Write a protein that binds this ligand. Structure first.
Ligand code: RYP
Length: 284
């Protein structure tokens, strides 16, 4: 029985290596990684791989791994797929811990923009969780943490993490991670998957996929949201993506809204993540 080596980058930056039968469906590998991580609340997570165009794709757990990675290496990342709107309602602290690790990478990477003060507050909870109570013996006036808190570090930010860290004495790791998440969940880009697109007029926009629906971003002043319940049908055709909207009260007809994606793979990818969000957050 022939086995393929899999490598998975975990959210702590370490690498998990295992073997699966070469005809294995994604669920097989996902189950191995989740067992490694001691993770029971698996529904919020998934594996990503990079396609021949170097685009991130979700590994479909129902489909053969070989038919998704195709010509590429069996190399994956473990990621949050569905960001819970209320992390306090997760059943296990360890689920919240992995969600914190994902959000820390969202922040450092710049995918999740964040004010100075919220960067310092999130950093202070991370430090409290991982090191425990503030110790002056470990930080002089010139302290620069090993912890990565932001896309760009300043001394002022390091100073502010330390000042807030002092305020958290007595806080336990689950308690600090819960505070981290109560702040992070409020950020306007929390759990938003962004896709470059053009509107039916050719104007460059971003489409955001999240718990609360499909968002449009255009020129800042020009924003729109389609809550998932309003969306009856998601479709793609060539380089185009469509949402069918329920008729409004007293309106005769449904409405279809159309967007142009970079290419056909990008339209199919946006379609699949929307359908998945629509189903997940309909049920959650
Ligand atoms: C040795 N590292 C290989 C790799 C694993 C996952 N993603 C990208 C590269």
């Amino acid at each position: 029985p022939k086995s393929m080596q899999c490598k998975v980058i975990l959210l702590d930056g370490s690498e998990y290596t295992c073997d699966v039968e070469k005809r294995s469906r994604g669920q097989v590998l996902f189950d191995k990684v989740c067992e490694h991580l001691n993770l029971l609340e698996k529904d919020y997570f998934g594996l990503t791989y990079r396609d021949a165009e170097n685009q991130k794709n979700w590994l479909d757990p129902a489909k053969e791994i070989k038919k998704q990675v195709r010509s590429g290496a069996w190399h994956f990342s473990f990621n949050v797929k569905f960001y819970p709107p209320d992390p306090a309602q997760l059943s296990e602290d360890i689920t919240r811990y992995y969600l914190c690790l994902q959000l820390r990478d969202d922040i450092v990477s710049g995918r999740l923009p964040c004010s100075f003060v919220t960067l310092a507050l999130l950093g202070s909870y991370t430090v409290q969780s991982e090191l425990g109570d503030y110790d002056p013996d470990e930080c002089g006036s010139d302290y620069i943490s090993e912890f990565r808190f932001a896309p760009n570090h300043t001394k002022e930010l390091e100073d502010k993490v330390i000042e807030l860290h002092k305020s958290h004495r007595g806080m336990t790791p689950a308690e600090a991670e819960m505070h981290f998440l109560e702040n992070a969940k409020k950020l306007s880009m929390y759990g938003v998957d962004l896709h470059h697109a053009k509107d039916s007029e050719g104007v460059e926009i971003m489409l955001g996929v999240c718990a609360s629906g499909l968002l449009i971003y255009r020129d800042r002043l020009r924003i729109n949201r389609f809550a998932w319940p309003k969306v009856l049908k998601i479709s793609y055709k060539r380089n185009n993506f469509y949402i069918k909207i329920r008729p409004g009260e007293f309106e005769q007809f449904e409405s279809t809204i159309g967007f142009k994606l970079p290419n056909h793979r990008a339209a199919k990818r946006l379609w699949k993540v929307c359908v998945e969000h629509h189903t997940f957050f309909r049920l959650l």
